[PDB]
Design a binder for this molecule. Sequence first.
Ligand SMILES: [Mg+2]
Ligand SMILES: [Mg+2]
Ligand SMILES: [Mg+2]
Ligand SMILES: [Mg+2]
Ligand SMILES: [Mg+2]
Ligand SMILES: [Mg+2]
Ligand SMILES: [Mg+2]
Ligand SMILES: [Mg+2]
Ligand SMILES: [Mg+2]
Ligand SMILES: [Mg+2]
Ligand SMILES: [Mg+2]
Ligand SMILES: [Mg+2]
Ligand SMILES: [Mg+2]
Ligand SMILES: [Mg+2]
Ligand SMILES: [Mg+2]
Lengths: 73, 119, 101, 88
Amino acid sequence: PSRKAKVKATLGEFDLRDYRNVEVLKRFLSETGKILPRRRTGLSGKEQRILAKTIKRARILGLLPFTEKLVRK
Amino acid sequence: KRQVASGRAYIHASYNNTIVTITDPDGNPITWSSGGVIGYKGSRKGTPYAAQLAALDAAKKAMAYGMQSVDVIVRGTGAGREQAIRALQASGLQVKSIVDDTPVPHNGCRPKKKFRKAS
Amino acid sequence: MRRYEVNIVLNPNLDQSQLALEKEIIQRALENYGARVEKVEELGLRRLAYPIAKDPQGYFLWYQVEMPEDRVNDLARELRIRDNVRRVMVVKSQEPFLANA
Amino acid sequence: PITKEEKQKVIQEFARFPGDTGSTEVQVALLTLRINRLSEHLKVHKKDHHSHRGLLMMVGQRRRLLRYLQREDPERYRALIEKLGIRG
RNA sequence: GUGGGAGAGGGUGGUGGAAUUCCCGGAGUAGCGGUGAAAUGCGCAGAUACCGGGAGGAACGCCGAUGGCGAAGGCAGCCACCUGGUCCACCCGUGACGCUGAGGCGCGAAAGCGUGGGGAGCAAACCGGAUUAGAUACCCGGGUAGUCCACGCCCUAAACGAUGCGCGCUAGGUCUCUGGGUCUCCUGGGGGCCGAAGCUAACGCGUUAAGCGCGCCGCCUGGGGAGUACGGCCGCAAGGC
Ligand SMILES: [Mg+2]
Ligand SMILES: [Mg+2]
Ligand SMILES: [Mg+2]
Ligand SMILES: [Mg+2]
Ligand SMILES: [Mg+2]
Ligand SMILES: [Mg+2]
Ligand SMILES: [Mg+2]
Ligand SMILES: [Mg+2]
Ligand SMILES: [Mg+2]
Ligand SMILES: [Mg+2]
Ligand SMILES: [Mg+2]
Ligand SMILES: [Mg+2]
Ligand SMILES: [Mg+2]
Ligand SMILES: [Mg+2]
Ligand SMILES: [Mg+2]
């Protein structure tokens, strides 16, 4: 699946290296802590890469989860 | 005897059997059922049917304490899971919701041969 | 010296006093290591994606003290000695790799 | 690490003439620096095998230049040494 | 040299959360477990399932690739420090300072060894259940060495691209990682696939050659006996060359 819209379009000029930008980062995670793929985020290796290094900080810090519970079903 | 009215229902499905549990809000169980409980004992404990019977028993007995609204939580991927869930729903118990909380390590202990093989 | 961003998350249950106390060390101990606080931006209370120290929230800080590399795994080794301090994050500063601009 | 200064400082110390970056001395000297450093790092991190091979090459590259110096102009050679800290 | 870039390349210290096991408390009751079926096993000294707390060991989900780094073995939570290699642009410096490399020296997965420590999960041996004509096995329940750390050994492998290193030459297409540009595309470095000429027993290789050439090293000479015997060298030993 995933032919909707990339998580990059729905957003603007933003430091992909800012580990505090919760409001934006939260956009790169599934219904779980899971870090969205590229087919999803629609980023470049260099980018997608950095994103993660950043996300993984949001985590230790406490701003971002490691995993979420799946509602619905 | 206690009169809970609103609690949660934990469903633990496994390839081998399904045990269902109904606790109260804070988390403490009230009553529980299982393939064994309902009577099946052996290879049958796993079959969805059993799960249906089990889940419904978890309810009946739950109904006693005055339960009415559970927040079904699933764990495991065993056979007869999305099955037990369908029971609690059609049990009268207003199923507030459903959630999948099957635990999963971020690479913890080496599984046993039975489930080994990395990729 | 190098530019390091410092993040600090301490117990979100202090009164003006109890708190201004911690920051006395966060500043004292800090200067004792060649602090040089290029800046600061106290964000305060935060709703943590997950409880930390069994606390549903946290009080966040953030600096930019430029200091002597040799004395960093130390500076932090020092900030950790605190009790009401539950997180010490010391990242090295980095240009803003802007994305989608 | 070795600072831009640290480096330049050593270059403008051996260079045959203002503008000499790649002369056979500058190089040796320069190396000797990079070497004498890592030789320290490894004095500690004995387990750091990979870095070592890095040094096992600088030393080579170093003696190889010298071997060439001692050939062309045995004078400058006898010089670079006394100036640095080799042959002893 | 200068200015830039990428990276699970290495070493040391710290530190994050998920999971299993164990302990403590709550609540709760007759089973859980496991299999093709079962049994052994565990549970009313209260197990399983659920909630809270604690201790500890090991490994790091998603990102993750059909990706990257490394000479090879190999390398992925996050942070800092210490450190190696390498690529691009500038054309700035030296002026053949080059290639290869017997022997030497160093590194070298796993298993294994020595001393000390650690020991959650896993598990040779082993102890049991089951299956079977038998079962010294595949399946199940346990479990020691080990797996982990340090220090010292050991030196093997389908240690594989089964393809030694270096340099030049010889159509293209396409996908991709990383740098530069006047950024449709051109240009450099690396990873793939299809392919000219050509090569090849065939399969296949084909600017990442197995093509056309030069240099240096290693190696082969029918199968079995045999990677054995003898000798030597190495190792604490197993055992290695
Ligand atoms: Mg020139
Ligand atoms: Mg000249
Ligand atoms: Mg020679
Ligand atoms: Mg070894
Ligand atoms: Mg080993
Ligand atoms: Mg041992
Ligand atoms: Mg076991
Ligand atoms: Mg076994
Ligand atoms: Mg190419
Ligand atoms: Mg290319
Ligand atoms: Mg042809
Ligand atoms: Mg081909
Ligand atoms: Mg023969
Ligand atoms: Mg042999
Ligand atoms: Mg001997």
